[PDB]
Amino acid sequence: PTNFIRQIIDEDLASGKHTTVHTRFPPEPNGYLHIGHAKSICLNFGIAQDYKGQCNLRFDDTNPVKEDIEYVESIKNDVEWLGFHWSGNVRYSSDYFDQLHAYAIELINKGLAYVDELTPEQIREYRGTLTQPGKNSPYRDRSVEENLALFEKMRAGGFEEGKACLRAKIDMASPFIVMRDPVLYRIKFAEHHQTGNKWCIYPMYDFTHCISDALEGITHSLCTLEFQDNRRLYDWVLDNITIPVHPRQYEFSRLNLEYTVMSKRKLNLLVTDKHVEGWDDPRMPTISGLRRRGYTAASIREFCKRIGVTKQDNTIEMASLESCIREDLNENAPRAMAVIDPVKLVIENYQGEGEMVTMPNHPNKPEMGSRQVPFSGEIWIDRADFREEANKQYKRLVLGKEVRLRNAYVIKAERVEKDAEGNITTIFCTYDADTLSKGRKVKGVIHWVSAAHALPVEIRLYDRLFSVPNPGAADDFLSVINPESLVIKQGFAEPSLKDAVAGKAFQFEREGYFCLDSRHSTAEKPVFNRTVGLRDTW
RNA sequence: GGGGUAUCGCCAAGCGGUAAGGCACCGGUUUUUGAUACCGGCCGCAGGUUCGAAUCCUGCUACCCCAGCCA
Ligand SMILES: Nc1ncnc2c1ncn2[C@@H]1O[C@H](COP(=O)(O)OP(=O)(O)OP(=O)(O)O)[C@@H](O)[C@H]1O
């Protein structure tokens, strides 16, 4: 695993610039973590463990209004669930409010900061545009003493929101818009989830992030491409205050996934408007959502490893992600029998109430042991596996042909029965009671579940949440939601599944990987989520 | 205006000496899962320097980001 960032780290180590690597994952606690965050997590924690260094978990809680304790809680859960551990205690940018406040005072004393009274609208008007330079505020020249007195007033709550703010004194004609006197502090009479109501002024991201990294001893600050401009302000702040270290920022491209949105705002909308059961709905690209869906922490790490880390914009295909969960589950998920679209089949040549047949826990792995399953003259099978008239390509059950029942006998169709609508209600067939080994020639195998002690199971089949590749680029991404993202079915599963535990995925043979969903499961009717289907192609 | 980016459908090695790999797709073998496994198939443009260019240069073109008291 190598990328431009690890090459930068190797160089620093060799040149002697650094003797140890210290990174951090700094999520703002304003929503749940998604697969995009996981990319950043593998990168940052990944780098630390490979270089025997440290990686911090720092909640960048600089905007109380959009934040909640709920999110800091779930975020820690998901980072841990992914298998990563942070260095020392969980950190919070808010742990540094007193420090940041002191640094703002240092800038003011050096005349590199001033309190501006331009309204929130006028500041945008004075900023200029992408092509036109901005102009200096009429307050820009206040004296140190006055800026000092005015900033203390901001802090003491003497100014209503937006009636004043602290700005850095840089260059209003800079081609970098972020350098046109960026706001350093803004007033918000809002309760903070960590500091309560001690503060009514809060530091902005650009002021907060570089100082927090610095204070924490960060060596390589890793973020996404949209902050490349910000790096100039990141360096300006550290170059102009009294601080011993100067971490360097390196930006890589964000992960984008086809058929889904990765914007926290848009995921929040889906949850707020109830278009998904919640942040962890199985169709969400959130970590908790992939977890419920049946994804393993190891398959997510594998994915992050495969997509690489560069500076090129990208949108990875779902197939790539699904490939990672299949490979994992294919190797470790024990097999089981279930029928999603059940049709009653009756073996007339079968006498008795039933018997017990042996079924391996993994056809390619005997070390996973075997189990006992009931077989009777009345077993459920899937509609799709039976057809009166079928070509040569079809290998399943045909009106007058015979197939091999999984881990059982070789039956043979003989007749059917249609109801009023004309839909088959029951398939009659006979079987060879001497089948359990390879004369003749059979071609085709199908799964089944005896109606004897069948377990009435609800199966949830999920699909892409959105019907277009780049829903985020649509005028209204909500209007492009896939109405079939979730299709609920009522099937039957072998009785052993009665002991399935949420968080353990089985491979329902010839149908895909599934796992119990504790949210909808009950003692009566269990609910299984289909993680992903098997590769299907004749 | 400034910051970035361009290598086979989607990702991505490469850092001037015959262009890795993964995903996808498509063939073939094995298979009592149409699965798995194992084979096989598959340098943005124009010039320039150079014995030699994906790599260095110049000039294009396309795309992404920046005009929050968000991050
Ligand atoms: N899609 C992504 N792919 C890789 N890293 C991401 C992605 N989205 C956010 N990150 C990074 O994860 C860390 C925490 O991000 P943060 O908590 O601020 O979410 P965010 O900025 O709101 O991103 P989003 O807009 O996707 O919600 C930052 O380094 C951020 O750049």
Name the closest-CA residue to atom 28, ligand 1.
Answer: A223
Residue A92 is given by DSSP the state E
- Which residue ranges of A make up the annotated binding site? 28-30, 34-40, 60, 205, 224, 254-255, 262-264
How far is residue A330's CA from residue A26's CA, in Å, rounded to a whole number? 34
Tracing tokens 């927090």 back to the chain, one arrives at A212
How far is residue A411's CA from residue A199's CA, in Å, rounded to a whole number? 76
Residue by residue, what is the 3-state secondary structure of A270-325?
A: HHHCCCCCCCCCCCCCEHHHHHHHCCCHHHHHHHHHHHCCCCCCCCECHHHHHHHH
Letter for the amino acid at A217? G
Residue with nearest Cα to nucleotide B3 C1': A229
Angle between helices A35-50 and A4-15 (to 10 degrees): 30
- Positions on chain B within 7 A of a protein C-beta: 1-7, 9-15, 21-26, 32-37, 63-71
> To one decimal place, what's the resolution in Å?
2.4
Burial environment of residue A391 by CB neighbours within 10 A (0 to 12, 13 to 18, 19 or more): exposed
Residue whose C-alpha is closest to residue A216's, from A106, A87, A105: A87
Residue whose C-alpha is closest to residue A463's, from A522, A409, A519, A533: A533
The residues facing A527 across adjacent strands are: A458
How far is residue A308's CA from residue A79's CA, in Å, rounded to a whole number? 20
3-class state of residue A214 by DSSP:
helix
Q: Which sign does the torsion angle of CA A16, A18, A21, A25 carry?
A: negative
Residue A96 is given by DSSP the state G
Q: How far is CA A461 from CA A431, A489, A532, in A?
A: 32, 8, 9
Q: Which tokens belong to A239? A: 């170059």
CA atoms within 13 A on the CB side of A220: 32
Q: How far is CA A47 from CA A5, A25, A54, in A?
A: 9, 11, 9
- Are β-strands A355-360 and A335-336 bridged in parallel, bridged antiparallel, or unpaired? unpaired
Q: Which tokens belong to A538? A: 């004749």
Question: Is any ligand 1 atom within 6 A of the Cβ of residue A253?
Answer: no
Per the CB < 8 A criterion, the answer to whether A135 and A126 are in contact is yes
How far is residue A348's CA from residue A344's CA, in Å, rounded to a whole number? 13
- Return phi, psi of residue A137, to 5°: -70, 150
Of A142, A264, A293, A335, catalytic: A264
Question: Is any ligand 1 atom within 6 A of the Cβ of residue A223?
Answer: yes
Helix%, strand%, coil% for chain A, nearest 5: 30, 25, 45
Strand order in the sheet with A113-116: A113-116, A165-168, A183-187, A201-203
Q: Which tokens belong to A179? A: 């350098």
The residues facing A427 across adjacent strands are: A345, A416
Residue whose C-alpha is closest to residue A202's, from A67, A100, A27, A62: A62
Per the CB < 8 A criterion, the answer to whether A354 and A376 are in contact is yes
Method underlying the structure? X-ray
Tracing tokens 């965050």 back to the chain, one arrives at A37
Site to probe by mutation for ligand 1, drawn from A34, A40, A250 as the one with most ligand atoms within 8 Å of Cβ, is A40
3-class state of residue A48 by DSSP:
helix
Q: How far is CA A464 from CA A313, A471, A516, in A?
A: 22, 11, 20
How far is residue A45's CA from residue A22's CA, in Å, rounded to a whole number? 9
Letter for the amino acid at A526? P
How far is residue A382's CA from residue A415's CA, in Å, rounded to a whole number? 16
Active site residue A52: no
3-class state of residue A517 by DSSP:
coil
Per the CB < 8 A criterion, the answer to whether A49 and A83 are in contact is no
How far is residue A184's CA from residue A206's CA, in Å, rounded to a whole number? 8
Question: Which residues touch A290 (CB under 8 Å, ≥6 apart)?
Answer: A35, A284, A300
- What is the CA angle A186-A192-A193, rounded to 5? 150
Q: Residue A222, Cα to own-chain centre: how many angstroms?
A: 19
Cβ count within 10 A of residue A123: 19
The residues facing A424 across adjacent strands are: A418
Letter for the amino acid at A35? I
- Return phi, psi of residue A63, to 5°: -135, 85
Atom of ligand 1 lying closest to residue A255 CA:
3
Question: Do you know the residue count of chain A?
Answer: 538
CA atoms within 13 A on the CB side of A509: 21
Residue A525 is given by DSSP the state S
Burial environment of residue A3 by CB neighbours within 10 A (0 to 12, 13 to 18, 19 or more): middle
| b/e sequence A135-144, b meaning 16+ C-beta within 10 Å | eebebeebee
Q: How far is CA A78 from CA A66, A261, A372, in A?
A: 20, 19, 37
- Are β-strands A410-418 and A424-432 bridged in parallel, bridged antiparallel, or unpaired? antiparallel
3-class state of residue A421 by DSSP:
coil
Q: What is the spatial distance, in angstroms and rounded to an integer, between the CA atom of A304 and the C1' atom of B37?
A: 25
Residue by residue, what is the 3-state secondary structure of A353-412?
A: CCEEEEEECCCCCHHHCEEEEEECCEEEEEHHHEECCCCCCCCCEECCCCCEECCCCEEE
Letter for the amino acid at A158? G
Residue A137 is given by DSSP the state -
Write down all domains in chain A, each with its CATH number in brackets: 21-93+204-253 (3.40.50.620), 94-202 (3.90.800.10), 254-332 (1.10.1160.10), 333-340+455-536 (2.40.240.10), 341-454 (2.40.240.10)
CA atoms within 13 A on the CB side of A354: 15
